[PDB]
Each structure stands twice: as structure tokens, then as C-alpha cells.
Amino acid sequence: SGFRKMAFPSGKVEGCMVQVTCGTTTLNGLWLDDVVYCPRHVICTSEDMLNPNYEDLLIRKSNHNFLVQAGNVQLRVIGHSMQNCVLKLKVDTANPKTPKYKFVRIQPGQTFSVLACYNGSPSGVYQCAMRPNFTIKGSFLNGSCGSVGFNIDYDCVSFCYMHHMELPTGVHAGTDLEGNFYGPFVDRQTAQAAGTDTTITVNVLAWLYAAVINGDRWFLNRFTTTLNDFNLVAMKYNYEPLTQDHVDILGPLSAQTGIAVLDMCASLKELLQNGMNGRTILGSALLEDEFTPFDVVRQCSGVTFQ
């Protein structure tokens, strides 16, 4: 038993991280087969950051302007191209540590692991969720651009996020690995604001099921509610509305605990209206929304990876 913010093991990703330098700008790249992927703003200088014309900036570069290092080994760049907001550098050596991988775009409410890197060297791993406003609440310092987010399904790494920038409010924005931003952001150093965030309701319910599995039961009651009665209260508290698909997704956790989803919703309704009265749930005094139903199942029933 127990419940922790658990990240995926990062070994398969650590061997794909490299350092990319162009001019006096250095950041991280992702080396898969014979291509290195990195944020295209590596080709900017101080004068360009405010209103860069990336087509102009790239045509003025040649392959030898790009220094790629995998630890000690230098990788020879033999080609470059731009795909949306990511740069693809063709190199002369295929990465022998390339795992089975795919590029997926995730949805708000989904979670993934971030391998934070500096100078091509992995520094730490943590779990976060994609917020409804398409930002993530990460932990990133200068030099972290090009760090990636990923999930592991069996033996396959699904890359879903490449880090590009920090917004003024301290949250983070980036792209999928095809270079398309999450959210309405662009890779220029203008002041951009994220939309208002909401709480991910299906995740809060999954976390309450994890609490019950671990012996925290004080918030339960025998009331029930309907989807529509719940959603009326949820919207008042800036909670995402709950759909029938969400109910179905929680099925396995309902089955395992014997507490119907709409029963659990009645408990949540109560917690939203009267607070938690200085009591805690799984060691938190706030309702946690960055565990998916799948995260809970994986941690409270146990699945490994190859």
C-alpha cells in the first residue's frame, strides 16, 4: 500500500538525450535513429527573440553551425530541416540506444513523466499533468529547453512533450514532437498569458478511490447524486464537468472498492461545499487532480514494463 507521485523509469529516455549548440545558444535535443529533434528557437539570438522570422534565420545557417554532442562523442550534422516549431538535424550516426517509440499528442487531464535535462545531461524525473489550459506546472531552470515528456506502454516510449518556454506566471509551455504547440502559444519572447485553469474532476475522483483503497474513508456518505446535479455544483467551483465517458473510465475503481461513481460524486459535492475541516486525504489537505484513473490502477494494483 501507500500512494506517491510516481514517474516512469527514465532509462530508455536518458540514452536519447544530447546537447545541441548553435552559436552561443545551447540546449537539449532528442536523438532517435539518425535524427536529433530540438526546439527551433536554438537558432535565435538576442536580436531575434522578440519577432523571429525562422525561415530567414534557418536559410542563413549551414550544417556546420550546429554542434551536437552525445556525452563526449561529437555527432556530425549532415542535414537540417524545420517541421513546425521543431528543428530536425540529420546526423551521420544512428543512435544504437534508440528504443521502440512513437510520437503521440496527449489531451488535457492526461499525465506524463518529464526528464529534466541540462547540457544534454539528465538531472531529474517527475510526473505532471497537462492542464486544461494547455500548460504544465513543471520545474525548469535556464538551459532546460528540449527536455521531453513521455509515457511508457509495455516496451514502447510514447513521447508527448518537448519543453520550449516558461510563461510569466511560472508555468510551462511546449509542443508535441511534431512541433505543434499545446495551447495558443508561439515561440517568441512576447508576453503571453495562459487561459484560466480548471480542476480535472475525473482525476479528483480517481484520487478519492485511491484514498479508499488505502484506508482513508472519512469523507464517504450514503447519499447519491445524478450527473446533472453534480455538474451544477462542479461548475460553481471551477471544476471540469463530468461525462458518461468519465464514469465508464472509473469503472474498475468502482468495481474494486464497491462504491458507485455517483456515490463518490456525492462525497466530492460535500467536500467542495464544506471543505475538509483540517482533515487530510492521502497526506494532502487539498483535492489532488494530477492522477488519472489509469495512474491509480497502475499504482494500486501493479503493472510493470519491458
Next chain:
Amino acid sequence: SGFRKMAFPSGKVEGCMVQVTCGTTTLNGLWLDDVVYCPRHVICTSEDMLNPNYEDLLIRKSNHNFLVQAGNVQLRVIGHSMQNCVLKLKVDTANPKTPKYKFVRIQPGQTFSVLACYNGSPSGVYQCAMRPNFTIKGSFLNGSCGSVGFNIDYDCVSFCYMHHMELPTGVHAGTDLEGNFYGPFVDRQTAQAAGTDTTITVNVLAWLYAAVINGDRWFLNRFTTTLNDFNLVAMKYNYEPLTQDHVDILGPLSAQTGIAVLDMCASLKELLQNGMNGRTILGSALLEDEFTPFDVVRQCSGVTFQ
């Protein structure tokens, strides 16, 4: 910026995990050079667990009773011995992925990363602290014994924990890698209780400095206090007393923020006496004590590893 529960990258450890089977009992082992380390209770059966005589149980075993698998490859066991509560299995092949490593015993209040494993396969990584009562608040299911805890200093993995059991209250107990338990526990299935836990004060202060670094300042004031006046309040709230060594350890965070340690103690004194009034610090509504001063520095100033 930002602040997350960040674990060390686990790649260097993932390649040392193997599966150990003896009879119908299977758990995880740690394969370094030509030795596999695992909890000695792998040699117990249902009849033995309550009052095992490990010397008796081991003399009745031969090398061929131990099945060790590294993925597909079977490792031939060519010798066995017991060192305190860990079993050492000599195998015919040295692990080619053995990192630079050392075995260290950590102190209460220190943090480390746990690589949770099942059937020799890494499942997740998370950060925890060694509690003052020598337990950890982990997340472990059946089959997790032999999972290890570690820190990474530069290129060197310091192994500090091997998982042995879950106590009745849902917390976890284990040994260092020399097989000596943390705390007053023994590897038998008797009911054992942990002592009362306390809050790790130097860690709470480090976390308040991280909050200031990240722009949460609402709890500051201009009061100051003395070590002895603070410790009188701390003991009333089940907080570990604060020493001059702790003050010195926080120096770099005092320097970076311009807030003297005893000033920060006055803020903590206030938070303990009046609570947080439904305000939050770094996204928590409780005082967090599982980040060391070194954890904060690493995350709020940036250090990588080789």
C-alpha cells in the same frame, strides 16, 4: 522556476535489477559485478515466516535452489552466503552494466529515490525521506521486496536502502545494503510497530526558502527569534529541535534570498501557532518536510549528473 517532487534519473539502476526465485517465492535482486543482493527472507516458506531460523534454512539450500533471471538470460548461481539480513548470491557472469557505486547508510531526515520493481522489472520511481522513526512512507505492492533506494552523486550511485516489508500502519521498513535494518525491526512476520514520528524541521525551513525563491512570500514577517525560543515551540508541535549545524546547512539558501535563518524560524513559529488560514505554499496546504536543503539547492539553482 517551479518546484516538484523530483527523483533521480533511474537508468543506471534499472540495468542492475534482476528477478530471484527460491521455491515458490520470487522477488527482486540487485546485480552488481558478480554478486546478486536480495532480502534473505526469499528462503522462507509459509511455515517459517513467523519465527524463521535463517541459519537452519540456508544450510538446507544449495546453489541450484536459486533461480536468477536478468530479463531472459539465466544467471548461474555458483555460491551463496548471508550477510546480516541480505543474501549474497555469487553468479558466473559479472554485470556489464555495473555503474560506479557505493553502499552508504543514510540518517533520518535524508531523502533518496526509490525504484519500485516487480519480477525484476522496474515499474516506477519516486522520492521519499527516511523518517525520524526509521520508516519510509513508500508505495509498494506484493512482489516489491528487494527494490532499492539510491542517490546519485556525479557519476556514482549511492545505494542506501533495500525494501523488506510493510508494517501494519502501511509504512515500510528495510535495510542498508550491508543488511542492517533501519530502526528496531526484524525480518519476521510478527506484528511490529514503529515509534512515534516527528516532523523534520530543517527540511520544513528549506521548503519555505524554496517558496520564497518561487515567489510565495505571504508568510514572512520582520520578527526574529533565538534557537532556544524556537525549539521550545517546536517541541510542543512534535517538531525535531533545530541545531546550529542545521542553521549552517541552510546558509546558501539564506544567502540567496537575503532572509536570515532565525528570521525564517520566526515565520515558522507563526505558522505553527495560527495555521495557514486556507492559504497555500508551493501548492500545498500543509508544511512539507521531505525536501532537504540540498534537494532545494539542486532544484532551485541546478546541478546535473554524469
